[PDB]
Amino acid sequence: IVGGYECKPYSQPHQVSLNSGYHFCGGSLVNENWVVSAAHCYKSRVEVRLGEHNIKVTEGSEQFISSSRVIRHPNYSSYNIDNDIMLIKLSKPATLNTYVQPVALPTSCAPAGTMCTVSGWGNTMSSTADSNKLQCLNIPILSYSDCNNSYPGMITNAMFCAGYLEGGKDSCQGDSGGPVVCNGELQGVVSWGYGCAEPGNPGVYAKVCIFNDWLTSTMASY
Ligand SMILES: [Ca+2]
Structure with a gap:
């Protein structure tokens, strides 16, 4: 993270x-x-x-x-x-x-702009965070359009993007498979992205709902 x-x-x-x-x-x-x-x-x-x-x-x-x-x-x-x-x-x-x-499985698919939490012991790309201690980050769900625009034609019905297109905040290697919780339900699984926390390359999550x-x-x- x-x-x-x-x-x-x-x-x-x-x-x-x-x-x-x-x-x-x-x-x-x-x-x-x-x-x-x-x-x-x-x-x-x-x-x-x-x-x-x-x-x-x-x-x-x-x-x-x-x-x-x-x-x-x-x-x-x-x-x-x-x-x-x-x-x-x-x-x-x-x-x-x-x-x-x-954690509960989703009762709905969370809409764009919902604020969620992702967590993990993956890479922190930080001189002050310790990946040995579980890390947390609040990320909002991005729109399908912004998601597809970032990765044209690669975003399927089974994916959503979340995070910040300006970069700096993202899940990363070693976080894979971990949770994205939104309003106390498992909405996402950490899946892929281009790099980590790079501008224009938001994290992509499996869409559990x-x-x-x-x-x-x-x-x-x-
Ligand atoms: Ca322990």
Whole structure:
């Protein structure tokens, strides 16, 4: 996260770290058994780390749970990074508590100009922010027209842009798969962009609200 601030610890208790020997992507707990992340973060098995603030220090709030299932959206495409959404089933349920709480799936698609929060342990491009401590940033949803204008013909129905076209504030490498929360619901998944925090190149997010039927049907299986 570029141009943000250190989150109040555990103020984003749905935020998880996906780990394969090291942090490589974020995700969001959506109930005690499932995490939503980005398809481009796929690995066939991952360790989900919940209850984190400082991913380098053992704080006593953590739960580390291996995945049992990693499910890419069936129509994920790297041409465009389209349908950039994945479900991770936990091999055992998470214990919900002060530090670990699921975020709700959207009851609507948030409109342009809605202010949201994005968070992660990705690159901060900053001499004073510490990516080891979960970072937070408030970003507004941009219009489809501004989004498409920034990346002509690459913005599909499954994407939205959010952030600041003037630059300086954005999600970045290592934030991928993490949440965009708007009015307390998971509206976005950190997906792609040209660079980070560059003028005219806003962040692009998977648009969770149009995936709800795929998400809930997939989670209904056991
Ligand atoms: Ca920790």
